[PDB]
Amino acid sequence: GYVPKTSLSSPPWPEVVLPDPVEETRHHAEVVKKVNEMIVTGQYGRLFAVVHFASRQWKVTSEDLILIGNELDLACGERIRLEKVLLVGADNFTLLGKPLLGKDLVRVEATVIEKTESWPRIIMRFRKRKNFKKKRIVTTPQTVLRINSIEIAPCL
Amino acid sequence: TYSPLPDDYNCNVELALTSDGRTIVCYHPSVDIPYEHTKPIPREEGPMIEQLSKMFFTTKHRWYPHGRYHRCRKNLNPPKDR
Amino acid sequence: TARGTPSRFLASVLHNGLGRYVQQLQRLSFSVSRDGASSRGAREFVEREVIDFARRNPGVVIYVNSRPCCVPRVVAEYLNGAVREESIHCKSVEEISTLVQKLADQSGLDVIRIRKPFHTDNPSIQGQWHPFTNKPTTFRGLRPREVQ
Amino acid sequence: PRFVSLRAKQNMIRRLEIEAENHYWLSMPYMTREQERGHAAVRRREAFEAIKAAATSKFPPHRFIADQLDHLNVTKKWS
Amino acid sequence: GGQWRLQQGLAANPSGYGPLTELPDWSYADGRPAPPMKGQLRRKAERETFARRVVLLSQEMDAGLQAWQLRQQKLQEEQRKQENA
Amino acid sequence: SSFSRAPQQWATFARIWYLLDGKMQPPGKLAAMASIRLQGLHKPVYHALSDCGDHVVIM
Amino acid sequence: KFTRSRIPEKVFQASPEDHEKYGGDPQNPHKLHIVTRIKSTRRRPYWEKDIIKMLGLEKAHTPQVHKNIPSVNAKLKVVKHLIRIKPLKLPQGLPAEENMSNTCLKSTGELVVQWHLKPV
Amino acid sequence: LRNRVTDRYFRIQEVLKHARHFRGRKNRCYRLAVRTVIRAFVKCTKARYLKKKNMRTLWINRITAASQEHGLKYPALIGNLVKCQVELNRKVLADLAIYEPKTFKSLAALASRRRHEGFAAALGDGKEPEGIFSRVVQYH
Incomplete structure (x- = not known):
């Protein structure tokens, strides 16, 4: 089943190894905890919302x-x-x-x-x-x- | 050790889903330029139109003038924004 | 057409929703003939609807002039000094009421073309794109074919 | 001379697949033809008696005193 | 990309049915819900006449087969009650 | 962010010199990258009349 | 001459491979069709234009409910190249008068009689 | 002449207020200005469709350019953001590409992350756990 490394042996794109969901769901829990601390303590400045007002999406700040x-x-x-x-x-x-x-x-x-x-x-x-x-x-x-x-x- | 984009140059992108799986939280603070990545601050109509062309890397034709019909169609008080 | 007409950007008068809302319509000037078949629907508007209208917004001062006109007019003046003169010639009372509420609801800005459907005054929050966003830097700030 | 690309073949093929599934779902009726007969004759007859009825109820509208007199308001004046 | 949305049971167009087009766009700031959108009222009228047609056709199918079974049973009773005397 | 009006405007529309070594390369596949950077189509600020093309130095 | 085309009956006889392909049962078939016009009746004969008008399919991409009876199937066999047919499947029941307004026909082909807008 | 026409300056001037900016005698002479003014109004209404079209290809050029800055291609970005149930449109993505390039970089990271879960999911075929961002939010 071995193919020696030629030009067309492997696909040309480099392979990504996506992370396992245990450490990845734990990592997401760390990130959402961080961002939720920024929302709690008011770290942010001004926001912009994309709002599906009426029939189209309006990118919107305040004022x-x-x-x-x-x-x-x-x-x-x-x-x-x-x-x-x-x-x-x-x-x-x-x-x-x-x-x-x-x-x-x-x-x-x-x-x-x-x-x-x-x-x-x-x-x-x-x-x-x-x-x-x-x-x-x-x-x-x-x-x-x-x-x-x-x-x-x-x-x- | 996976990174979906090389979080090196614009912002350090850290994606997240929440526990309900409904909203995607992105966390992306700015990447400052390092001090090591910096340099210290160092301390006639014919030939005029060729000289301007070669100065600003454009052709010659936008340096010739235009007639009054085009100079007066122009809006001199254009609307401003922002 | 748009190239024959002037255009403008979408705006307010003095940031009209930020602190409070101010009715941009100062004065209405009705002029209604007493005997005259064109100002019939104006007559029945002064008799029925103009007092209710004048109570639904007290920042508007309304002048009913009632001279011998041959065409009746309404002249809306706005806080920014614009004047919209519209006719109420041969209109019913309901059509005049929707016209007068139309003039009440709007502002003195022109009904020329509006360029963009929006007006941010701070469009960018994360910093607008310049061509050195999304580029990595080099060691000691070198450029291509730079030896030292 | 005009030639057939891969867009045109793939498009033609997905129309053939929609067609084949139309062939499948027309191949198993819920009723036979003896069972369906007269199973909706009442509703069809009442539907045509409604079409018939709206056809045979066509006539000029009512004319009123109040409209003709209400034209006199064109010279209503003030006092 | 809507063939994906057909794989997932969604509308092929995200402006079809679902949460972007059928929730109300706005409310009052007090919390009073807005009067309904015109297209949502029109659309619920279309869905309801569609549902009335589904129920109507289903009932004509079922009453059609029941009336056929009465015609077959009464044909067989006219068979067995004429094999006598 | 937090620039003034004029240096933000200068920074966005400023044009960038690119280098591009064409050794052992095909000329059309260099020409595609060069053409994109000459029209400014590699910028999200791009518009045809706004004149945001760059310089391409092909060696 | 271009004429009206009869289609033989072996064309409309399912095979058990097709019962493995699509999701159908030859015993106990479905009651209601969903028919959808997806190819214009222009550049088609006038009889097919008429059958599209009878079936109620003058708008493209709008579903229409029909009976799975051989007369409606005969008209559908005339215009089977312009339409798309799916079985109307009904996961819950047909809607009673309580659930009459709050329905939604989904794109799968099913007709759900409780259409909330909340995620599961 | 019993009743010949008095009110003809105003019909001419209804046409010629639209032609005041043309060239040649088209701004002046009514016979020429009618053909050009009609023809300008026909273009003016057929250009609504071309305004919509040209904005959309302009947005695809801006999303294409800004997503090539992050290595992605445009079909990869739009496809794998549909697949994340991020139902933003082209106008909003182009405006984020210009004005908020960190949100655009994180959207490019979410779309390439979803693109790789699509690769690894459609490579190791069979019953497996789905990707984390590959999950869909069912609406009922």
């Missing part, structure tokens, strides 16, 4: 803005807890869920600032030699959110 292409049917000024946060990072650690994080772990708040419409947005169709020329002008509603805080909790 910023998101322009969303639908009317949320809330009053301007109302606070909102964004569920479906799915990544939370700080400077020295992150947390990512499968696929979402626990609601007891991360709390992302956001107020509604303004409920505008878009700029008028032209929808023109034209086929040549056919006298086919249609024109429509569309403004979608929009709301702007101001992400107030990404507060994190020691629940690991």
Whole structure:
């Protein structure tokens, strides 16, 4: 069953030996204990959440803005807890869920600032030699959110 | 002794799952440049366009000017961000 | 089109959600004809809905001018000094109420194109990528083909 | 001249596999043809009597006094 | 990469059914749950008419075979009750 | 992080000289690496109009 | 001439190798099909366009429930190249009126009558 | 002329406010400006599809570049992050690649770790314990 070391004897990639799950689950317990100490003692600075707000993933810190292409049917000024946060990072650690994080772990708040419409947005169709020329002008509603805080909790 | 990437240059990446297996905790503090890895601080239109081309390693064509129709279409108060 | 129109970046007026929320709409100026068929739905808006509206937001000062107009207008003025003049010409009361609440809910910023759908002012937390992130250093800072 | 790549063969093959499993699941009916007969004749008849019924109930709408008089509001004024 | 998601019983598109698209996106900061999403109400209407159709077709299958068995039993009773006198 | 606006902007878009020894190498397989570093397509900051290409010294 | 194609019956007779391949039982078969249009009816004959309209499959990638009776199977044999068929398997029962709203048909082919959104 | 048309300056000016930045007589003459303004609006609506397309290939170029910095290739990264039930998208991964390269490095470590568990799992075939990051979170 031996093959002598030729060019095509072995596969060209170097083999990795993945660690055994006893020392690896123990190692993960050490790491989650470290990161949970950083969340307990407040070592982190500012956070950024990836939030699956609406239909798309917005990468978000605190104190910023998101322009969303639908009317949320809330009053301007109302606070909102964004569920479906799915990544939370700080400077020295992150947390990512499968696929979402626990609601007891991360709390992302956001107020509604303004409920505008878009700029008028032209929808023109034209086929040549056919006298086919249609024109429509569309403004979608929009709301702007101001992400107030990404507060994190020691629940690991 | 396994490392999924050579945790040497950007940050020391230490992955973890939690006990429930639902969240992946990554722990990655920064790798400082060592003091050993450092050096101490040491203590006419034709030929002008060739000289600028050879100085900034670009071609000659962006040093020739452009007409007023292109100079005045330009937005002189562009929107700023961040 | 976007190249013919001006564009801008998404912003607020004075960081309008951070500390508190401030209603960006200062003044409304309704002008409604007494006898006139175009300001009928304006008339029934002043009679039915403008007092309820004026109580639902007291930071808005509302002027109903009621002159002989031939087209009635609403003139919203905003805290940053913008003026949106819109017509309430031949509109029903419900259409005027959704228009006036539309002007209330928004801010004085232009309805020109917004470039990005977001505005972080601190986009980077771990430090933005420069081409010497993700590179290893060498001993004594050498470069390729450096002898000593 | 146009030739057949490996994309096209693998795509054609996975359509053939979906097809073969369609052949499998059509090969074992839950009923015979004698058993199925008339087993849904009532629901089909009531469904067509609904189509028939919406067809034969077509007529102009009601005309009202309040609409015609409500056009007089176009000259409502103030006092 | 969705053929993997078919191996695991998940939706082939992560924007299909599951936790990213069917939990509510937002709540009030007090903790009042939001009014429901329009697409989630539409989608639950689609799932419910689908479920009504599964139940309806199942009942027509079962009552179909039961009525066939009455026709076969009564044919055999008309066989045995006409072999006499 | 914590740079000012101008040296962060300088640091990101600054262009890097690469060395590339072409001894016993095929010219197209050098040309692929050289082409990627000439367009700036090895940078995550890449855009066509933003002009973030580098220098490739092939010896 | 291009005409309508009959398909012989030996094509639709399973072999025990196929019962080892797919997950089927020749005795006690399944009641409900799940049919899904996955290939356009355009550039297909007009009869196949009609059968797709009868079966309720004008949207692609949308499942439809059918009966496993020989009439519905005859229409499915006409358009078997455009569709995909799976057995509707039901791990728990068919939904009663309590569980009527809280169902979800999963991608495996099973129809679960309690669809929480919580992990196990 | 009983009623000839008074209000024709404004129809012209409805077209020509869109042409004020063209070249040649297209910004001036109505007959030329109509063909170019129509043709600009047709491009303006067909370019919505190309805006979406070109952002996505731009994100794949940025994820490709930043993951080649860590040795991975783009198909390896995206495949083995799908396989970790990290359902981030391309926009978010490109923006983390630029602005948060430690989170991107740890995601490259999670995807190459999962890639190697896929290798070692699909090498030693048969009943074995699954990998640690290979486990899936069942939702019911």
